[PDB]
Amino acid sequence: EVKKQGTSSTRQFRQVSSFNQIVVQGRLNVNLHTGYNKPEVMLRGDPRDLVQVRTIVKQNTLYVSLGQGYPDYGAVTVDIKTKFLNRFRYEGAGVVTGNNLRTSYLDLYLANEGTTRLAGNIGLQKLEAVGNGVTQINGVSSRNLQIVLKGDPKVLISGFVNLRQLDMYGKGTLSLYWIKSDTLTIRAKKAAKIQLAGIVNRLDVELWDFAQFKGKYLRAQRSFVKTHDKSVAEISAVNHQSSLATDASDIYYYNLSKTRADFMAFNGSVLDMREWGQSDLKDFDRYNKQFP
């Protein structure tokens, strides 16, 4: 148990064996690179604490965390170069930057303010953010993805995602840029912000309280929407729309579907919310004229 006083940040080069999973703990910064050379790791830190910075390998893994306890360390920079990555775990108020990563499947686990950037083409099936962290991912091409959140993440994902289910009980904000799915089931419990856009064959939305679903620019052929007290949903149904508002909730549509069916229970309301000045606006038919 030693501190870092009296020592400044110095450059160190070290050699590491083969690893396929990285677990990093501590208030530090990680830079990732990808090449066809040997793997290596560079540990920029204080020479009193270069021994305390632990680079250990146990069964095709890499554990970069605190060694001999944590009396004090302020700044650690970990640059990494390898070939294959399959799991990434990050904890303890840090920064992660990586780009141009090619993979088949790997799992992110961010916890406790991991300010993270990925600027590659990562096909990931699972991802987890614990709480109070931002995440900006540019480029995801996966055939399956399941996201569940429990804390306060601020996460945005770009690419192509075949999402299947979504549950939120925390204070999360999530935005995906392009999706191409077949059946989505969205459940929002306490205070959620969801922003999707793409093509969905069948959509089911459940909002309980203080939840906002902005499913505008997400064109759904079949939509089932249920809103309970003080929740807002903005949908873009195309072929068949079925909506229910229970009590002091608001449902808005933005497209005139071929079949519309809306229900109101106590104080909820479903509104048209179109432009009225668009030059190609469409009127109701014999088959769409429902009077609220």
> Using CB under 8 A as the criterion, which residues of the chain lie in contact with other proteins when the complex forms?
177-178, 197-199, 204, 217-219, 224, 240, 242, 244, 246, 250, 259, 261, 263, 265-266, 269, 271-273, 275-281, 283-284, 286-287, 289-292
What is the smallest separation between the CB atom of 15 and other proteins, expressed in angstroms? 42
What is the smallest separation between the CB atom of 41 and other proteins, expressed in angstroms? 36
Please identify, using beta-carbon distances, which residue of 47 and 266 lies nearer to other proteins.
Answer: 266
Angstrom distance (rounded) from CA 62 to CA 22:
5
Please identify, using beta-carbon distances, which residue of 85 and 218 lies nearer to other proteins.
Answer: 218
- Half-sphere exposure of 279 toward its Cβ, with a 13 Å CA cutoff? 0
Pair 96, 122: CB distance under 8 Å: no
Angstrom distance (rounded) from CA 262 to CA 10:
66
Cβ–Cβ contacts within 10 Å for residue 49, how many?
23
Residue type, 251: I
Residue type, 239: N
How many residues in the chain?
Answer: 292
Whole-angstrom CA distances from 169 to 161, 173, 192 are 22, 11, 7
Please identify, using beta-carbon distances, which residue of 86 and 175 lies nearer to other proteins.
Answer: 175
Hey, is 39 helix, strand or coil? coil
What is the smallest separation between the CB atom of 220 and other proteins, expressed in angstroms? 11
